[PDB]
Design a protein around this ligand. Structure first.
Ligand SMILES: CC[N+](CC)(CC)Cc1ccccc1
Ligand SMILES: [Mg+2]
Ligand SMILES: [Mg+2]
Ligand SMILES: [Mg+2]
Length: 331
């Protein structure tokens, strides 16, 4: 049981203000309607996810974090239905979103997902360093393009091997986008010389893996009944021919060894900055980047233990029907 499994240095003070902003935003954009969908959305507590996962974000930066999360979660659930069993259709819908990434704004009257994404993306890139924009644009492309491969795997009905699981799951989980968002919301720019160090590249990959694997464990109940295949627990069980409990234990171990690797490498970061001759301001941005990665790991988990999304989904949206009350994504 998820309540019996365990794997924040702060919480953003803007939580309550962002709750108010984000409630108006999802309704204004058409991303969340009224009634069941609104109560269900509210029960996820996207503001607390933003405030725990991005504690460096203040003011309008935290608003952006919560709106981005709102997009991720609402868009994600649109595939818990016929769309997630139709890879060609999923690929076409996600090509629409990808065009927004690379410059083709959707125009007035676009669907709610396209309009919400375009707003998040415009706010994200406004004033951002061009190196951040290029990298994050490609991160978005991977996220959108990976959804159809999850659908392919659902039709296959067997989990992939570990390598193929990671390739699909890292994409559909949002790849490095949460860390790009946290960097942007903290107002920092990681110097490229530090960003591409072996230590920080390994740490970034480890942090993203830790969070998606923690999600795999806690979201297994709602996913397994829908025929989802890109979940670490299912992958381990299938590869090892072990019991469910043995697979959960192994999944905890995949998380733990990555946290250990991350923390071992984090100890080298001061020396790395000195070897590169980074300025004091550059070193301060690297230090904040370390905190951003640390807070995504600890803050995501703090959120998922109190949200109603995972305990509630099997009861309010059973696997015998779609995983949404309203269609907001035209296919
Ligand atoms: C990033 C938000 N996400 C994935 C797109 C929305 C469903 C859930 C998630 C959070 C953290 C790790 C993995 C997945
Ligand atoms: Mg998903
Ligand atoms: Mg999902
Ligand atoms: Mg999940």
């Amino acid at each position: 049981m998820p309540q019996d499994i365990d794997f924040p240095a702060g919480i953003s003070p803007g939580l309550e203000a962002t709750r108010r902003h984000n409630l108006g935003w999802v309704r204004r954009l058409g991303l969340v309607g009224d009634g069941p969908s609104l109560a269900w959305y509210t029960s996820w507590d996207m503001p607390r996810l933003a405030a725990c996962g991005f504690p460096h974000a203040r003011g309008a930066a935290l608003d952006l974090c919560a709106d981005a999360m709102a997009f991720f979660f609402v868009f994600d659930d649109q595939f818990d239905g016929p769309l997630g069993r139709d890879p060609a259709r999923a690929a076409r819908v996600c090509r629409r979103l990808t065009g927004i990434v690379h410059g083709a704004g959707p125009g007035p009257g676009a669907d709610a997902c396209s309009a919400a994404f375009a707003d998040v993306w415009a706010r994200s890139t406004d004033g951002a360093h061009p190196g951040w924009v290029a990298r994050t644009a490609h991160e978005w492309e991977y996220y959108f393009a990976a959804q159809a491969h999850e659908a392919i795997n659902r039709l296959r009905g067997t989990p992939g091997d570990m390598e193929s699981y990671l390739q699909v799951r890292r994409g559909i989980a949002g790849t490095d986008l949460p860390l790009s968002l946290g960097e942007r919301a903290a107002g920092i720019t990681v110097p490229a010389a530090a960003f591409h160090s072996p230590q920080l590249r390994i740490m970034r990959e480890a942090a993203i893996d830790v969070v998606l694997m923690c999600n795999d464990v806690y979201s297994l109940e709602k996913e397994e009944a829908r025929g989802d295949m890109d979940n670490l627990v299912l992958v381990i069980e299938h590869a090892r021919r072990c019991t469910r409990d043995e697979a959960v234990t192994a999944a905890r171990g995949e998380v733990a060894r990555r946290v250990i690797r991350f923390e071992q490498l984090a100890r080298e970061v001061p020396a790395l900055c000195a070897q590169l001759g980074l300025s004091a301001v550059e070193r301060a941005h690297v230090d904040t980047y370390l905190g951003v990665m640390e807070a995504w790991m600890s803050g995501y988990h703090a959120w998922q233990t109190q949200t109603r999304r995972y305990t509630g989904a099997p009861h309010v949206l059973p696997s015998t029907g779609p995983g949404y009350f309203d269609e907001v994504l035209p296919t």
